[PDB]
Amino acid sequence: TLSGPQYLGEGLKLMMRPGLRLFVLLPLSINLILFIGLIGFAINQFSHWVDWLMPSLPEWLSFLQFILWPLFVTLVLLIVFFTFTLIANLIAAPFNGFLAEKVEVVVRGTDDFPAFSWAELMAMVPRTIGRELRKLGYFLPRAIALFILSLIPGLNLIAAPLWLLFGVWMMAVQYIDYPADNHKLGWNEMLAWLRSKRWACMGFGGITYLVLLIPLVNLVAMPAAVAGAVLFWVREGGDQ
Amino acid sequence: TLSGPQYLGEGLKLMMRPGLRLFVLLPLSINLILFIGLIGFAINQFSHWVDWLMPSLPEWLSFLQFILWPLFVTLVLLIVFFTFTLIANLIAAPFNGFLAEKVEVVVRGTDDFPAFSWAELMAMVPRTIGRELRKLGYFLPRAIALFILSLIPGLNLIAAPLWLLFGVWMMAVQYIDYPADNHKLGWNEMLAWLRSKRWACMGFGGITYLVLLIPLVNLVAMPAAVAGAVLFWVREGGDQ
Amino acid sequence: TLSGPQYLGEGLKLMMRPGLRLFVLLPLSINLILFIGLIGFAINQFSHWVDWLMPSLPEWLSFLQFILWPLFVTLVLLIVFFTFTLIANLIAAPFNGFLAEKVEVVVRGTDDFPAFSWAELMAMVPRTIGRELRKLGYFLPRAIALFILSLIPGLNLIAAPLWLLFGVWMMAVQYIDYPADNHKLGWNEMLAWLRSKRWACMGFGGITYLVLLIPLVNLVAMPAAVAGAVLFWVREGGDQ
Amino acid sequence: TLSGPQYLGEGLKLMMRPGLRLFVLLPLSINLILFIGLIGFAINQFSHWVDWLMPSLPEWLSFLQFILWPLFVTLVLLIVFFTFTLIANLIAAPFNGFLAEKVEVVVRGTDDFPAFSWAELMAMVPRTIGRELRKLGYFLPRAIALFILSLIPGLNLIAAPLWLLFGVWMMAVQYIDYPADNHKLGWNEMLAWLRSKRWACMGFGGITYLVLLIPLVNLVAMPAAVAGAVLFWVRE
Amino acid sequence: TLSGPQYLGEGLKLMMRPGLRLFVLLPLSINLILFIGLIGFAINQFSHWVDWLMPSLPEWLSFLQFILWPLFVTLVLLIVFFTFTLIANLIAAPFNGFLAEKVEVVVRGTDDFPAFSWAELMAMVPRTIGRELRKLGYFLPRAIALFILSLIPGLNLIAAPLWLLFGVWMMAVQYIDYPADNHKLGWNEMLAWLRSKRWACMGFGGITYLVLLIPLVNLVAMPAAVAGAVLFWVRE
Amino acid sequence: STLSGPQYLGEGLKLMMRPGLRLFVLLPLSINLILFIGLIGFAINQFSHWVDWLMPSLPEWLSFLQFILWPLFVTLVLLIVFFTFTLIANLIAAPFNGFLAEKVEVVVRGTDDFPAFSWAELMAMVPRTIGRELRKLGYFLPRAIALFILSLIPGLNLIAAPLWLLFGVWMMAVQYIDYPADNHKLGWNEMLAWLRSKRWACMGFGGITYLVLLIPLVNLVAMPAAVAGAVLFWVREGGDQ
Ligand SMILES: CCCCCCCCO[C@@H]1O[C@H](CO)[C@@H](O)[C@H](O)[C@H]1O
Ligand SMILES: CCCCCCCCO[C@@H]1O[C@H](CO)[C@@H](O)[C@H](O)[C@H]1O
Ligand SMILES: CCCCCCCCO[C@@H]1O[C@H](CO)[C@@H](O)[C@H](O)[C@H]1O
Ligand SMILES: CCCCCCCCO[C@@H]1O[C@H](CO)[C@@H](O)[C@H](O)[C@H]1O
Ligand SMILES: CCCCCCCCO[C@@H]1O[C@H](CO)[C@@H](O)[C@H](O)[C@H]1O
Ligand SMILES: CCCCCCCCO[C@@H]1O[C@H](CO)[C@@H](O)[C@H](O)[C@H]1O
Ligand SMILES: CCCCCCCCO[C@@H]1O[C@H](CO)[C@@H](O)[C@H](O)[C@H]1O
Ligand SMILES: CCCCCCCCO[C@@H]1O[C@H](CO)[C@@H](O)[C@H](O)[C@H]1O
Ligand SMILES: CCCCCCCCO[C@@H]1O[C@H](CO)[C@@H](O)[C@H](O)[C@H]1O
Ligand SMILES: CCCCCCCCO[C@@H]1O[C@H](CO)[C@@H](O)[C@H](O)[C@H]1O
Ligand SMILES: CCCCCCCCO[C@@H]1O[C@H](CO)[C@@H](O)[C@H](O)[C@H]1O
Ligand SMILES: CCCCCCCCO[C@@H]1O[C@H](CO)[C@@H](O)[C@H](O)[C@H]1O
Ligand SMILES: CCCCCCCCO[C@@H]1O[C@H](CO)[C@@H](O)[C@H](O)[C@H]1O
Ligand SMILES: CCCCCCCCO[C@@H]1O[C@H](CO)[C@@H](O)[C@H](O)[C@H]1O
Ligand SMILES: CCCCCCCCO[C@@H]1O[C@H](CO)[C@@H](O)[C@H](O)[C@H]1O
Ligand SMILES: CCCCCCCCO[C@@H]1O[C@H](CO)[C@@H](O)[C@H](O)[C@H]1O
Ligand SMILES: CCCCCCCCO[C@@H]1O[C@H](CO)[C@@H](O)[C@H](O)[C@H]1O
Ligand SMILES: CCCCCCCCO[C@@H]1O[C@H](CO)[C@@H](O)[C@H](O)[C@H]1O
Ligand SMILES: CCCCCCCCO[C@@H]1O[C@H](CO)[C@@H](O)[C@H](O)[C@H]1O
Ligand SMILES: CCCCCCCCO[C@@H]1O[C@H](CO)[C@@H](O)[C@H](O)[C@H]1O
């Protein structure tokens, strides 16, 4: 009855109520620390990194340095961004998993005020980081496939839609995974599960993608998305 | 003999001969009268309608009115336009049906000079208005669907071609129905009928679409699209 | 002697050195709190806002509520975004201003390690906030002008360049004022004085804007722009 | 007095009152007849025209006919439009002029119910047809100029604004003329009269442009623009 | 182990070795002689073609010849180019096959080098020219179709990819045909063959497409494509 | 005298068509042939290597970037190869154009309707005419890079497209109308002043010359036509100093 994007909205509701409300701070804080620590580092090495990527040129081709400069400078940033993002989700991987349990007990009425402890969090770290690596393995190859498909002057027009649709579906697997993996469910079994809910989890993943495009709101958005995903897992069925 | 778009042309021929020659003036004359009557009222009401759609705003945001004015003024115009066409087509519905019948008797040779009588027209009105409503009910949801699909950044590129192709298929169903409905044929039965004749009525629909973009020529073109569709019905199966 | 976009570069150096590094953490924490506070506010009021703007309609026009809904949701979003920006800048105004003085004493050689104190910061707040209000009062009119010029289908092509040319100039008056305002210097007087350094401060503002197009940069760049602007005030004319 | 375009708006008020707008239905009904005639004609001869325009080609180049077919067809269509747009406006020239007088007596209070008689219309025809022909002469060179400039890849960017600004300015000279021409004023004297105040005509013609973009509303926007122009002639 | 676009590279290698390096010169010589004569021809007759294709208009409509001018000029140019491109490749058709055979024997170790003889080339000419005429018969209708498809306002977006995919596929059928036609390969069986090998021959055809986008490098790239197509024929 | 505008290029094509000047049309093509035939092989063998030079060395983790970085440098390299080639070819065409311009002049002035080609005087021209094309490049490439950097700015590109076009036309005037002018020991600055006084005429000439040189197979006939047309522009409009 709740199928579609409605879950996301409801997930936000689940985050606003006390005792789950303070867990919302986790992603931002991660990205905060990771930013502040890394930013300074990046600041010092930015100049050096481009100097490594740029080839040595003779005096006659030295003019190419003017055209090649903006490139690697862009590329470095593109790397520094992606690298950071890559780490952020990794450090955010356990917390989200830990959250997906704590949301669930509230969804079913078991304990409306779940408690945070580092013990069970550190105990979750390996399966949930490894699971973040499985997600990365499922995503990144297909991403490079669609992107190289888009670099072709003829074929990009079919790549833009495939890109979008895939990114939505990935919003389904990324977040609905957290309760599925917390129920020790196989990767294949969960992807088949989402394949059976493809319309529902495509709507959920879709509005999740959209609301996750808002830059500052990303950080309040993700916890809502996790909780909404847990709700998805409870309202669709955890039989597998 | 004629398969493909050729029917439209032949429809023109049929409308050129005496006795069917004046009905070409029915659509044009309708849109004249309709406009002449409505324009007046519209002029007075237009100003008010936008003020209604425009939100009531506080002092600091009042500058937004300067930017919201064009949008709402645009929107109302669009609505004011569609309504017009929507009403016009409705009023054009029976006259078309009455033509598709009267063209048919000429195509099959029963009466070389059919007469116009308001009696059987008014007798037609409720059913034919009902069918134009069934057509709008078929079209408007799929149209909206395509449009929402166009506002999606990734999927818009797949939205344009689908819009064209559907608008063509719709040109088949709008006009080939007039004789089919005159023959008391089920809606789904005609849609499957045309789905088996996909190519033929997709060609007829195609040229009918193109020619009916030409702005004022529409009102002379349409009766040709009717007669042409009656020909599509006569020269191809009347079987049910 | 020392000139061009290099100021920004040099300004960055001043921020990295022992004694001036932690001041960069002042705006971020603010933007954190300001975000954390406002975002929750937005979360709760969002419905009421989009419902306020939306007009009350009769039953048959109720379908319009579907087209007006995304619109207002966007509009509200934009307000929420711009309002945030507007507030953020304002709160950033004194921390910027307070910095422009503290950078200065480091540039001159009195004290290599300045200390932060809430007393004189709070003593600065009203003057500097009123200052940046003078800035918004100088900027927002010319901005609205160029924007009404760009809405005209014909003139919009000359609006894009005219936009950029002003945006670079603005970069000068925003930052270079911070030390000047600490020296009790008049608004129109500073406008006249910088009207002479137009080229230098336009290079400063040029690299300032471009370098401000990157997201990572901004959080570390505004301090670099403030320090570089202080440096610009010291090595060139402080005369009055 | 009335800043920017209010004249058009005020002009529309004038047209909506009974007595000043049955006059609107006159040229429209004619252009209807014109429309019906020209369309039927083109129906009969469209094939003759495209076969005339198409060159005779060999069997190896016969497939070229397949690319030439859409072309002349387009071309014929275009001519057919412009001819009509040209003729209709031509036929519209006197009625508008005849209206511009009949508007003025209502503006100044002379006669609240103007009388329509074919006599004084036919008497206007030569002067007002000549006058609209002068307007076509002022317009077409600068229009072709901007179109050719707009074909240029680099300079096309300067052709789009110059197009709009001209298309707006022209809306002044056509309409604000109808009263001036009724006052027996020289062409050059009127262009100096309009260039005397650029902003005013620029707003009047500006909204008149935008409002003449609305598809069926043209038919009511034009009369408004005439009377507003009459109003524009009287108040200033 | 060698599948994919690598064949292109390898074909290049085969053409670098002595005795096969003389085979590179002929397509260049064809484009050269043919080009020089046909271009001198083009300059004198151009005026007659554009004047021939352009229709007779009355003197009022005379101005239309100004818009039709850039068009027909363009059109003639396109014909001029296509005709050249049409003829050019025809004359290269047998030299290709005659080359293809001489490459195959090098792949299997049969021949270190063969002295060219006009005899066997002339013996090939009618069959292989009939073969490339059949290639034109497969190609040109799909192209005109895709072009009419690109004229459609909605479907033009689906025309852009459809072109490329076919342009690549054609580059498979064009070159991999030449060894096939050396073996009297029946038309249906080769098209099915390349349809069963879609990935390999489509990558081969792909790099062939792209490297053939390079203008003067076309001339050295085509022999590499022929050699690569023979290797594609032998190893799979 | 009445011949002002872009008509010069047409008339120049006419001059190249009459006997005595007709085979000089083959001077550019042959050049572009030879320069290609010599270079082509070299380039191919070393193309693979050049991209590998410009491409950065990346670790195990950043190796995937090679999939996106590869096509880039390959294009970049190609571009350079093209520009450099077109650079070099134009240099070799510099004396021939000048020589042709000189020879065209005697046909235009009715002195010798069938001028003879001799390697003596062409080789005599080489140093002057090359140096003068180096000056042409010096006038062009800085201003061109300026327009390109200006087009890189997000706000100002819209003003970079027209400026680019107009400057390209103007450079057509400078390049071709210079050829007769250099033959009469005319200074660089003073010819820029003279063309600046003929800006309407030579800007039309440079306009059609530009367009005709955009068509690839046609440009081989048009380049001589542009030289001759430029000689006629020099003859019919003051060659005075
Ligand atoms: C756009 C730049 C945003 C701030 C982060 C990178 C700033 C790098 O800045 C530079 O760092 C170099 C060492 O890496 C020093 O040599 C320079 O003096 C310093 O200006
Ligand atoms: C403000 C920054 C917004 C960028 C949002 C882009 C969303 C990309 O998508 C994400 O890429 C990540 C790796 O980078 C993976 O961890 C995720 O599984 C994948 O969904
Ligand atoms: C991660 C933050 C996600 C916010 C997703 C919000 C989805 C909101 O959903 C909207 O909220 C309103 C609630 O009153 C409803 O009236 C609307 O009909 C509903 O679409
Ligand atoms: C474009 C001109 C449209 C004409 C407006 C309507 C018909 C003439 O206008 C008015 O219409 C009224 C009813 O609306 C009639 O009662 C009046 O007799 C009338 O003059
Ligand atoms: C273009 C000039 C005006 C076109 C018609 C204006 C409509 C006039 O007004 C309309 O008709 C009656 C008066 O005529 C009024 O009483 C009606 O209330 C109004 O709807
Ligand atoms: C869809 C047709 C509407 C576009 C034409 C112009 C509408 C402008 O409507 C304005 O409303 C005013 C309010 O009374 C009236 O004085 C006039 O009707 C007019 O000035
Ligand atoms: C293109 C930029 C804005 C053009 C001017 C918009 C003026 C908006 O002003 C509007 O005028 C209307 C009456 O004329 C009123 O109904 C509105 O309430 C008022 O906001
Ligand atoms: C596209 C048209 C915009 C929708 C708004 C239509 C007007 C809705 O507003 C309506 O206006 C009427 C007349 O003023 C009033 O009688 C009604 O009380 C009011 O509901
Ligand atoms: C004042 C009444 C509201 C505005 C009327 C909009 C009527 C538009 O009507 C449409 O105009 C098209 C051209 O635009 C024609 O091609 C169509 O045949 C016609 O249905
Ligand atoms: C940019 C900030 C986006 C805010 C999206 C907020 C959507 C959630 O909204 C919140 O949840 C309720 C539903 O339970 C809504 O009715 C109210 O807006 C609010 O309480
Ligand atoms: C097609 C564009 C329609 C815009 C309609 C604007 C008319 C709004 O309404 C009118 O605005 C006038 C100002 O011109 C005022 O003088 C009138 O009192 C007012 O009724
Ligand atoms: C095809 C039908 C054409 C209709 C043309 C209507 C001509 C207008 O008719 C005029 O109307 C005036 C009041 O408006 C009266 O004052 C005039 O005496 C009358 O001639
Ligand atoms: C369908 C609604 C009425 C149809 C009749 C309109 C006849 C056209 O009318 C004419 O059209 C020309 C070009 O659009 C205009 O320039 C003329 O002023 C106009 O009189
Ligand atoms: C450029 C192709 C040929 C010209 C086509 C446009 C013909 C119609 O053009 C219009 O006719 C009116 C007559 O009054 C003029 O006043 C208008 O300004 C003019 O645009
Ligand atoms: C083959 C014949 C094609 C000629 C069709 C006549 C088109 C006249 O159509 C007119 O176009 C105008 C815009 O220019 C619209 O604003 C008018 O409402 C409409 O009447
Ligand atoms: C249609 C009349 C002009 C000829 C159009 C085709 C242009 C050239 O077409 C080419 O022909 C070559 C062989 O000639 C083939 O190798 C290519 O696959 C093909 O693209
Ligand atoms: C209306 C007829 C349209 C025919 C267009 C076909 C023109 C041939 O297009 C061909 O495509 C090849 C790659 O695909 C290129 O290598 C050739 O240069 C080329 O001329
Ligand atoms: C690179 C080698 C140059 C050969 C190309 C043409 C140069 C010679 O050109 C020829 O010179 C003859 C007399 O010498 C003239 O009579 C010919 O008309 C002329 O065409
Ligand atoms: C960004 C668009 C690039 C188009 C292709 C390269 C155009 C510039 O090309 C250059 O023009 C110069 C001036 O005459 C010549 O000196 C150079 O030889 C030539 O390479
Ligand atoms: C050494 C291999 C590099 C290849 C560079 C060749 C680029 C050739 O360039 C082409 O040459 C023709 C004249 O020669 C011109 O007609 C074309 O405009 C041009 O694109």
CSV table of C-alpha atoms in Angstrom, one decimal, chain B residues 52-53 55-57 60 64 67 72 75 79, chain C residues 52-53 55-56 64 68 72 83 86 147 151:
chain,number,residue,atom,x,y,z
B,52,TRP,CA,-6.0,34.5,-8.7
B,53,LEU,CA,-3.1,32.1,-9.5
B,55,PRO,CA,0.2,33.9,-4.5
B,56,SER,CA,-0.4,36.5,-1.9
B,57,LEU,CA,3.1,37.6,-0.8
B,60,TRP,CA,10.2,41.5,1.3
B,64,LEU,CA,9.0,38.1,-6.8
B,67,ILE,CA,9.2,37.7,-11.9
B,72,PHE,CA,1.3,33.0,-14.5
B,75,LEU,CA,0.3,29.7,-17.8
B,79,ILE,CA,-4.8,27.0,-20.3
C,52,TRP,CA,0.4,29.1,1.3
C,53,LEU,CA,1.4,30.0,-2.2
C,55,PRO,CA,-4.3,29.3,-4.7
C,56,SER,CA,-7.6,27.7,-3.7
C,64,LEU,CA,-4.3,22.6,-12.0
C,68,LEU,CA,1.2,24.6,-9.9
C,72,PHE,CA,5.8,26.7,-5.9
C,83,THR,CA,17.5,33.3,2.2
C,86,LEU,CA,21.7,36.0,2.4
C,147,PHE,CA,18.3,40.3,-15.2
C,151,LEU,CA,14.5,38.3,-19.9
